[PDB]
Design an enzyme around this catalytic site. Structure first.
Site: not given
Ligand code: MN
Ligand code: MN
Ligand code: MN
Ligand code: MN
Lengths: 403, 401
Positions: A170, A211, A213, A244, A247, A271, A279, A281, A311
């Site tokens: 990433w 990955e 984003k 993800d 993302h 993820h 994002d 998280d 993640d």
């Molecule tokens: Mn990720």
């Molecule tokens: Mn993330």
């Protein structure tokens, strides 16, 4: 007990074999990320919730507390800044299998598999927010080298632990404001990747993932490594796509991608994290999309083909709880997806009986999943229901608040 | 005009060669769609004066073309066959049914692009087509698509410019599906079949178009973005990107450069989505300009096949084509007149301040002056004068229908 037994026949009327789902559930491994434990600090030489881990040995003990409360046998996902340099400054382009020796002895000790990531942020050589795609060749060359080192490190794990390590790339590369060239930096990304993957590695030891984003804080206008870029790139070069769930665009759904990837890729990587408007998280919750992901993994007979990982990063709560609430939910959803009557659900859609397909999907939302889940937890030596919370409170009192 | 000449000097100050741009612009064709003209009615067995016959549709097309600078292309749909007396099933369509289309095209210096028609039909009543669970259905649509590939071929042979045959299918489900995979597997088998026989790329190219959702197809669409993007990558086909077809705040702009790294060519439909695939006449907006910039500054003026895809029946239909195509040419123009070299170089060098100021400052540079000149060299009315042609035409012809 018999709460579980009555639940069992409710599913059996549909021909849903719960005993069978529990054997199958036993074996699916979730890759849990080490970065949650110390707020993505790492061990690199040179107002939140209290009690994070701050030394390699504190982080390991913490991983074990969480694993001891999560059913099954899983894997740990490492970042390269988790290297144990033994009190020496070692540059990122120089990291070596012997820097993760302790992690591997520990994984082998516990029967964990291990996964890996090159780290391409929080670094001098990344201040401009470009990296594998920096205009300077010496910066680009430094990061290429590091990704090649991580590829070797990942092979090391697969060699040692007897289970393929997924090494995922990433990058944070992008521009905060409107770009006047979108093509060149991606071109450099392609060249930088052609190089990183120059050398074959046995697929039994390592696999490579890219990955995408959509945007970051500081790269809100444009991200170099985009969904369409890594999709084309991975397909052309036989790599894995890592998705993800945080993302993507608003409304944008990962569950709708899985079946389409499965047609052109032997494997893909996941993820799971919870986005709340960015994002962000957040910790994963047993929500509709989570279930819809699980549905796709199961219906599509893809449990050996979707490499599931976590993640997420919440420092505003107890970090051991984050790990345990996270993984338990994703296991719950697989369980739920395992307890769905796909055969009759599918025939109804073949025959266009949309009435029953709507009706029964709806009606399984109150089928007695708790009872199945509880028993599964008991057979696997973890606390049922909200009991695991007692164990985090002791551990917070005795250990975490002492740090 | 001196006015032009002062404009010319302001752009030249940056190194931008206006005359060179004008000569470049004049070169680029835009694929104008026929279905605007008759409300997607077709000829197969609201604002007044829509066309009800081929000759009307052509007259309207001609009138529109005369208000747009340049020399362009026309995009046909299978339902627009001229079948003389008979009823022809969609799986039986042959080049002879588009003879008169081609005769007219050749006469007018136009290219013809093409689309099989996979909607409003008994056999698409269930909302599946190529991915129908039933073999007889899929088989029928495969043939239509194969028949259409030959017609694209015939076009390109006859017009010595390749024809773009685009495939778009309505397939999806209204509500949450219980299997997202096997319909997609069926679509896959199906296209394999369709593309099985090889055609020369000098005469015909194939494209495929995804959509996120449509009315009656909200929950799931078989031909999704990832699906088609993978497919065109494995089998050397084109992706067609419709600007109306992605998630909220998702831009086709950001996709163009990612895609050019991996495909020779690429096709777009431009149409304005207002909160859904609503197919509004194209406007000279943020997104259009960002799309233009991407084509011009990436050298993709021969690699991106630009087409229109809107349908607005609430306004004059001739006006629709002309505003629409005129803004896409306007936007190309604006993108040619931007100082890319120094802009690229400021981004390369860290000077994001100058990058922002200068993109911004160019929003007031004198585009109109140049555009006006261009319209006069190309013998089309400047500014709004074109409404008068429209208004005379509405009276004399449109309204005696
Ligand atoms: Mn990720
Ligand atoms: Mn993330
Ligand atoms: Mn379109
Ligand atoms: Mn559309």
């Amino acid at each position: 007990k018999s709460q579980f037994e009555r639940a069992k026949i409710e599913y059996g009327q549909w021909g849903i074999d719960v005993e069978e789902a529990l054997e199958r559930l036993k074996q699916v491994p979730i890759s849990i990320h080490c970065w949650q434990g110390d707020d993505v600090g790492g061990f690199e030489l040179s107002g939140d919730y209290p009690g994070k881990a701050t030394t390699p040995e504190e982080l390991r003990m913490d991983l074990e507390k969480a694993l001891s409360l999560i059913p099954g046998k899983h894997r740990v996902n490492l970042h390269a800044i988790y290297a144990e340099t033994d009190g020496k400054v070692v540059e990122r382009d120089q990291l070596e299998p012997r820097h993760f020796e302790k992690w591997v002895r520990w994984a082998k000790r516990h029967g964990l598999g291990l996964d890996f990531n090159p780290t391409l942020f929080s670094h001098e050589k990344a201040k401009d927010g470009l990296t594998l795609a920096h205009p300077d060749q010496a910066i680009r060359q430094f990061w290429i080298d590091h990704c090649i080192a991580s590829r070797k490190i990942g092979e090391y794990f697969g060699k040692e632990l007897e289970t393929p390590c997924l090494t995922n790339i990433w990058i944070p590369d992008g521009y905060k404001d409107t770009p006047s060239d979108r093509l060149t930096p991606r071109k450099r990304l392609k060249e930088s990747l052609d190089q990183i993957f120059a050398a074959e590695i046995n697929e039994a030891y390592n696999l490579d993932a890219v990955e995408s984003k959509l945007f970051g804080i500081g790269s809100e206008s444009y991200v170099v490594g985009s969904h369409e870029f890594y999709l084309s790139y991975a397909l052309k070069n036989d790599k894995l796509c890592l998705l993800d769930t945080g993302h993507y665009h608003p409304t944008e759904t990962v569950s709708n991608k899985i079946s389409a990837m499965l047609l052109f890729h032997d494997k893909l990587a996941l993820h799971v994290s919870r986005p709340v408007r960015w994002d962000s998280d957040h910790v994963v919750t047993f929500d509709d999309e989570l279930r819809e992901i699980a549905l796709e993994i199961v219906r599509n007979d893809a449990l050996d083909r979707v490499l599931i990982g976590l993640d997420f990063f919440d420092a505003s709560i107890n970090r051991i709880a984050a790990w345990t609430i996270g993984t338990r939910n994703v296991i719950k959803a697989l369980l739920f997806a395992m307890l769905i009557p796909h055969k009759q659900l599918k025939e109804w859609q073949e025959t266009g009986d949309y009435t029953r397909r709507l009706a029964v999907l709806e009606e399984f939302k109150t089928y007695p999943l708790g009872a199945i889940w509880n028993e599964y937890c008991e057979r696997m030596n973890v606390p049922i229901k909200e009991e695991w919370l007692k164990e985090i409170a002791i551990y917070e009192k005795e250990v975490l608040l002492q740090r």
